[PDB]
Every structure is written in C-alpha cells, then in structure tokens.
Amino acid sequence: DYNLRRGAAAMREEVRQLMCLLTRDNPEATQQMNDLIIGKVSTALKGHWANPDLA
Amino acid sequence: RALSVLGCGHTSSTKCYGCASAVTEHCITLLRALATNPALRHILVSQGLIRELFDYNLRRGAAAMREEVRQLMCLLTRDNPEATQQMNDLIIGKVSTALKGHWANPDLASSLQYEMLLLTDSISKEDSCWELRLRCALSLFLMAVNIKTPVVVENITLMCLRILQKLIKPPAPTSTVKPYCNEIHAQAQLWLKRDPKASYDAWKKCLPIRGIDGNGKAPSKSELRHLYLTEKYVWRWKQFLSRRGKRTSPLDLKLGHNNWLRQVLFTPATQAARQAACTIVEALATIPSRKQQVLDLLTSYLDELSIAGECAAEYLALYQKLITSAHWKVYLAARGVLPYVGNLITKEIARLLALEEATLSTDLQQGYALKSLTGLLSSFVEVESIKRHFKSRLVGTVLNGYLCLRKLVVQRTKLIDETQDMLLEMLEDM
Amino acid sequence: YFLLQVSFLVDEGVSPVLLQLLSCALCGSKVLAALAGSQEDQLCTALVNQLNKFADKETLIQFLRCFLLESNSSSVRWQAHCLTLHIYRNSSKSQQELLLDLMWSIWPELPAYGRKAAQFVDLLGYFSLKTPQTEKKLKEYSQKAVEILRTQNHILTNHPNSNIYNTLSGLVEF
Amino acid sequence: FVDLLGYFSLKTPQTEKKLKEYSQKAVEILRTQNHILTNHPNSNIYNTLSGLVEF
Amino acid sequence: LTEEQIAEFKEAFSLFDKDGDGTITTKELGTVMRSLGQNPTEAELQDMINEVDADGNGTIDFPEFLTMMARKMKDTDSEEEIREAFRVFDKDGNGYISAAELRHVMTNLGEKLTDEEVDEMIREADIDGDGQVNYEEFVQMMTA
Amino acid sequence: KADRVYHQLMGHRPQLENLLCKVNEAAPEKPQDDSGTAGGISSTSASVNRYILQL
Amino acid sequence: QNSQFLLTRLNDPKMSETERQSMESERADRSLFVQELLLSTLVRE
Ligand SMILES: [Ca+2]
Ligand SMILES: [Ca+2]
C-alpha cells in the first residue's frame, strides 16, 4: 500500500525485493501479494478508458 | 462537378489522431449547439451522451475543449432531474472509489480533478435540480473530511468547501423564511438518504414566512404578549405531536465540540480549506442563537489553536471577528472563557519552560499560540465589566505567566517578547 | 446558376471572386468576400429563390462540400459560410428543410476533412436549432451527431499511439 | 547503526519470543513512518515534485 | 430556588450590567438569560423586554430580574398562561377553540398551513371527537 | 531574519501548489512564442511545459 | 472578432427585475437551507 510507490527508485526496487523475499516458499504470503496485484489490475481495467492513470 | 469528383481540395489520412481529435472537437461544438434546444437536450440525454462525455471526453483534448465538454454536460443536466441525478451518481462513484486506497493510489491528484470540477461548474448552473447536486457535494465533502490525507483534502474537501461556500454566501444580490430560534428544522442524515420528508420544499414549508412585522408606530404591547403565548404553545403543540410520533421530529441547536468543523478550521494541507471553513462558519453566524452555538464551538476548538500553532491564523481571525462586539465577549466571559484561556496560556508557558530545559530547538512560529491566546485575553480584558469581575481571578495566572516567561533566555522569541510585554501591560492594568 | 457551376471547374484562386459575385447577388458579406432599401432585399430573396429553382440537390451538395469543407483556404470557407447562411435565411421552409437535410447527409463524411470542417459544423448546428423540425428528424440528427462522437472516441481510445500522445500532452508542450 | 542491528539480529541465535518482539518493533517503526509520510501536510507536494522535477 | 442558582444569575447579571441609549439594559439582560443556560424565543425576549419598563433604558435591578425569571423560570409549564393561551387561541371569547381561529393564530405568528394540516392539528387535540377543543383537551395536549 | 525568510519560503508554497494543480491538469498548451525572447529559452526548454518550467 | 462564429454568439443573457427579486430570494432561501443542513450535520449524535 505505502512503500511500493514512494521513495527513490533504488528504494522502490529494494521494497519489491523485500516483498519477493517475504513471499518466498510461503504459499499464504505469495497468494496475498498475487491477489493484491490482481485486484489492482482489475480496478484499473474497470475504467482504463475512463481513467488514463492506469500506467 | 465532374472535375470536383475527379479531384478537389485535400483530405486527411487514415488513423489521423490529430484530425480525429479535431472531428471530436467539432462534435463537441455541434452538441453544445444542439443541447440548447430542450427537446434535443432530452433526446441526447436519452442517447447516452452524458456517459460518453464522462468516460472519454472529460480528460482528453485541449483545456478549452475540456471546459467545453464540462459545459455541455452541465447543459444536458440543466433542469433535467434524470440527467442530473445520473451525472451526480457518476461523480460520486468515480470520487468514492478513488477515496478507497487513496494512499495506495495517489493519482487522485488528477483522477477526480476533472470530476470535481464538473461538480463545481454544475453547482454554478442554477436550476431546480440544485438539490441533488448539493446532496452529492455534501456527501463527497463529509467523506473526504473523514480523511486527513492532504491529497484528499486539497482536492475533494477543498472543492466541496468552495461549493458550500458559494452556496451559503451567494454572489452578492443586485436588486423569505426565518429559522426557529432554538431548533434546526432541516435534517442531513435523512436528506442525504433521498427521504421525501426532508427536502428543500418540505423544509421551506416547515418554517413560517418572514412576512412583515409592521407595528412601526404601534406598540402592540398586548399583542406582543399574545403572540408570545400563541407562539410558545403552538411550538408546544408541535413538540407534543412529534413525541407522540405523528409528526417529523425537529433538531435541537446543540453541537458535539469535536466535529468536521474543527477538522477543517485546522488543516495544514492548505489554508484554502481553512479559509473556506472560516467563511462558512462566518456565514453560519447570521442568527444570534446560531452565533452563540458557533461561538461555543470555536471556544471549544481553542485548544486546537495551541496544538496547531500558526496553522490556526484563519480560525483566530474568524474568532476575533465574531466577538468584535463586547456583547459576545461578555457572553463568553460569563460561560467561563477567561479561566480557559488563562489555563491555556499557563500550559503553553509551562511547555516552553519544559522545552527551555530540553534541547535548544529553534522554532520560527514559536509562540504564535501563546501570543494569540494572550491577545484574546487582552481583547476580553479591554471590556470594563469583565475586567472588574475577573481582576482577582486573572491576577494570579498573569503573574505566574509573566514570571515563567521571564525565566526564558535561550528560547525567547520575538513573539515570546511581545507576549511578555502584553502580560506586563495586563498586570499593570490589573 | 452558371457562375456557381463554373466555380466547380476553377482553381481555389478563382473560387473567391466567383463566391464574392454570388455574395453581391445574395446580398451576403460582399465586403468580407472581397477582404477574404426594401426592394434591394426583395431582389436578394428573388435571386435566392431563382437559384433554389435551378440548383438541384446534387450541385448544392457539391459546392457545399467543395467550399465549406474542401476549401483549404479559411477565407473561401468563410465566404461559403456567409453565402450558405444567407441562402438558408432567404429561403422558405421547404428549401430550408432540404438544405438542413443535405448538410446532415454530409455530416457522416466529416471525419475525412478534420479541422477544415469547423465553419461547416457552425452552420449545421445553427440550422439544426433554427429550423422548426419534426421529432423524428430531430432524433435522427441527434443520433448522427452522437454516432460520430462515439466513433471518434473509440478511434482515439484504441489508437496505436494514443498513450504516447496523452502522456506527451501531459508533459512536454507540443 | 541499522546495519549492525540487522546483522546482529540475524547472527545471534535468539529465542522466538524476542525474535517476534524485534520484528514487531521494526514493523511498528515502519508503520509509524508510513503514516507520517502519508498524512504529512505537504506530502502531495513532495510526491508530485519527485514525479516531475529533479531535486 | 437554591442560592447556587441566584448566585449564577447575579454573576451574569453583573457581567452584562451596562447602560447607554435605547434600552440596552433590556438587551444585556436578555443576553444574561441566554448566557445563564436558558434561551427564550425572539418573541419571549421581546415580551420580557416590554414586560419591564420601570425607568429609562429599561432599568432592571437584580431583584427585578429575579422577579422576571420567577414568573416563567424554565418555562416548563404554566397552567395559568395555558388558560390565557386557550383564551387567546379561542379568538371569540372562550369555551372551545376552532380550526378557523387556530389558523388565524398561525397566520398572526406568520406560519401558513394547508387547511388539511389544520384538520390534522384539530383531530389530534380533540379527544371526545365532538369537533370542539376545551381546556380539558387543550391542557391535555399541553401536558401530553 | 529567520522569521522573514520563513515567510518568503512558505510564501512560495501556495504558488507551488497552483503550479502542481496546473501540471496535473496536463493540458496540451502548445509552446507560446512570447515576443520577449531576452530570457535564454532553448527549443527543448520551450518544449518543456511552462507550468513544469514555472514549477 | 469572435462574431463570425454563429454558435459562439448564441449565448444570450436576459434577466428581468421582478424575476431578479424572485431569483435573489431563491438564492437567499437556498443559502439558508444549506446553513441549516450543515448545522444539522454538526449536531452531536
Ligand atoms: Ca369558538
Ligand atoms: Ca371535547
């Protein structure tokens, strides 16, 4: 929710690596992040033409 | 025509994004022309033009084209309940969904930027449908104020406050109902729920017409007592009818002292929101009983001034403006505002003392709350009767404050010096 | 009628002079045409009635697309705008409806002319709201306008480099 | 400082109770800072400027 | 009345105590009452301000203000004025108030109610359903 | 002195917020050929959004 | 200037004196309604 999009690009890539580490060999953890991404994509697609902030 | 058929003028190429946008602009101009005719306007709304304009044409094109699209949508919804209800619902859906995970998706800055400008321009259009538009505005305002995120405040709450301010304080007139003194005959929870019991028509029906008081040269002493009795027991008749449950229940002029009012009066996101809230409260202060209630609200919020420091400049200006008459100064003094401000000054000076022995943290506004509280106390003391009745009770706190301020050496700020001088003047005067 | 019909086989350089002659005939913007009492207006109405008696719908359609749409010279387009506006004003109800129908027939072909169409659209809109018209054809005109809008909106949305143009319009001034 | 902390936190064999305590402390500080940044008065300004202008 | 209350009345009375042109003292005392914790309707305020005209600027003494408030206090009830109400509500003498004079009172106040609303009001007041309302029913509603 | 320079720094805040709102509108304002060319405005800079440049 | 375009010239302001008074009264009543609405919004639950 918070650390994925804020900070320097190196900090963003470190946050992504940290999440990937948290979801390593953890079926519950990996599922959570996967579902978050799915929901985000779906709501953005709900109005990709309506809202061009999808990217 | 044979030569013209062979070749004449020039044509655009296929997939011409530029010319395709030019044709879109021509369509917008033509539709703005057609929408003028009411029958054509209804036909276009029935076509589904509002949704198309909302989804696609609101955000693309030159800024002049965007404002023309917004005007076109306003024209379609003008004096059109079905169209205006639909547009208001679209606005709520797009704004409400953005509030969800606003921290997760900060695009809000530009996402609702256009939807809320549509609501603002719509409110500007004056029509009987104004009710649904005001409903949408109030709902969005409350939702966004429940949020402290500046991105959310500065967009949604700021445009909602501006809409409410332009509605409450109408563009100055260039050429009918008075509220009950002790009651609020309108309801907000019911009105937002589209209940026909609470509405502008029903509300305006509830209150009496202003009419003409007359009796310019007629004392009407007997008539004054008569009207007193009839008013009192007619209100009693309605109150009893309502507790039996056969009539809608009016609302009592009473506030919680921790409402969105303070939340906005103090908003570090921008002064715009604070200034709009100050204007709204100043316009709510039209009626003397409502003046009393908002004065109680503000003197309760007084603590948030100390909390927020220099962000409360607008609230301070509003509060001093509302009590510029010694009448309301004396009223507040009777309620006990003077001990409250004295305790606040003592607490602020103690906090400075506590920081004096702590780290040497330099602050530019250090003492704005202290200076403002002392200015309020001086303004109250500048009335003779309050001075007479509260000299013995304020001498102790002024002495303690001045003595504790004299201890300050490292944290002594220009504002602290002005506060100490004001306390000295007050003490000499006491 | 022959001056218009000739204005078909002439260059865009000769077009304005013929258009200005037609304007002095329809008491249009002769001064504007050059730059780009009651009996007199009676003669103007007589001349437009004579032209409508001669000018079939095909030639009317042809010059209306030729000068209002394919001119490529805004000055000739304004001359045609003034000429057609005065033609419609000085015409009676039947020719007014017929001219409005012809321009609404040209309306679907608008995407091929882009910006040039501006003046054309003007007249269309004005006429569409100036002629008392039946509900059926009002709905037809509205449907045509909204259909063109939907087509252009879908084209812009699905355009291969729509994302690029949107983002650049957001950032660098182009 | 943080460097040493992290290293030590993963270098000393430690009980589950204090492991949970250390994790809770770290995530609590992260939550506090995230809320501070999200609700910061000029957070919108800094986010937008970081987006557009180099500084 | 406990001293605690008379002391509070004197406190605000002394705080608002002021003199000048017109009848400021009357206005100052109306503000005292509202400050004390009892807000009278604009009509009540005007009535009391008139109900005190002993000296210039509506001179009011603390005993005088005590007398003023003692009459209504919290305005909880006043069967004496409730009878006077029935006397007024019933424009023609007294006996039984009717919808006509009820709507007359409503207009004199400045409220416009549809005859249908007036009928609702009279149906509520009447108990024996004789189309008439006496103190028995006026008082009943005022104490309902 | 700090009080004074404080006012100047925070005095720009409102103007900066205005520039932010204007850029967020993302309007295609074609480069305006201002008669005054005394300022060293390169073609690339002129191409860069003026709101962006003003910010 | 901008008078060449008929469509832009279309907008016609027209507003009468008694209807001025009625509209101003409507604005005042709407303002009062919004004031009561916000005050009822602030009322403690
Ligand atoms: Ca009777
Ligand atoms: Ca009876």
Numbering used by the authors:
A (entry chain B): 3911 to 3965
B (entry chain A): 3857 to 4031, 4044 to 4298
C (entry chain A): 3302 to 3337, 3385 to 3522
D (entry chain B): 3468 to 3522
E (entry chain C): 5 to 148
F (entry chain B): 3745 to 3799
G (entry chain E): 287 to 331
Anything the authors wrote about it?
Organisms accordingly deploy silencing factors, such as the E3 ubiquitin ligase silencing factor of the integrated stress response (SIFI), to terminate stress response signalling and ensure cellular homeostasis. After restoration of mitochondrial import, the E3 ligase SIFI marks HRI and its activator DELE1 for proteasomal degradation to terminate eIF2α phosphorylation and restart protein synthesis. SIFI forms an antiparallel dimer of heterotrimers that comprises two copies each of the E3 ligase UBR4, the E3 ligase KCMF1 and calmodulin. UBE2A was captured by the C-terminal region of each UBR4 subunit that became ordered in its presence. Together, these proteins assemble into an approximately 1.3 MDa structure that is built around an open twisted-ring scaffold (292 Å × 229 Å) and two arms that extend to the side and span about 356 Å.
For structure determination, we purified endogenous SIFI by immunoprecipitating its largest subunit, UBR4, and then performing size-exclusion chromatography. Having ensured that SIFI was active, we used single-particle cryo-EM to resolve a partial C-terminal map of UBR4 and associated proteins to an overall resolution of 3.1 Å. The C-terminal interface is centred on extended interactions between helical repeats from each protomer that are cemented by horizontal coiled-coils at the inner side of the scaffold. Calmodulin docks onto the outer rim of the scaffold, close to a hinge around UBR4 Gly4301 that connects the C-terminal dimer interface to the catalytic module of UBR4. Calmodulin’s N-lobe forms a bundle with two helices of the UBR4 scaffold. The N-lobe is not bound to calcium, and calcium-binding residues are not required for UBR4 recognition. By engaging two distinct regions of UBR4, calmodulin creates an intramolecular bridge that stabilizes the UBR4 lid to anchor KCMF1 to the scaffold. Following an unresolved linker that is predicted to adopt a flexible conformation and of which mutation impacted neither SIFI binding nor substrate degradation, KCMF1 is further anchored above the C-terminal UBR4 dimer interface through a helix that is enclosed by the UBR4 lid. The UBR4 lid engages the KCMF1 helix through extensive van der Waals and polar interactions, including a group of Trp residues that encircle the conserved Phe319 of KCMF1.
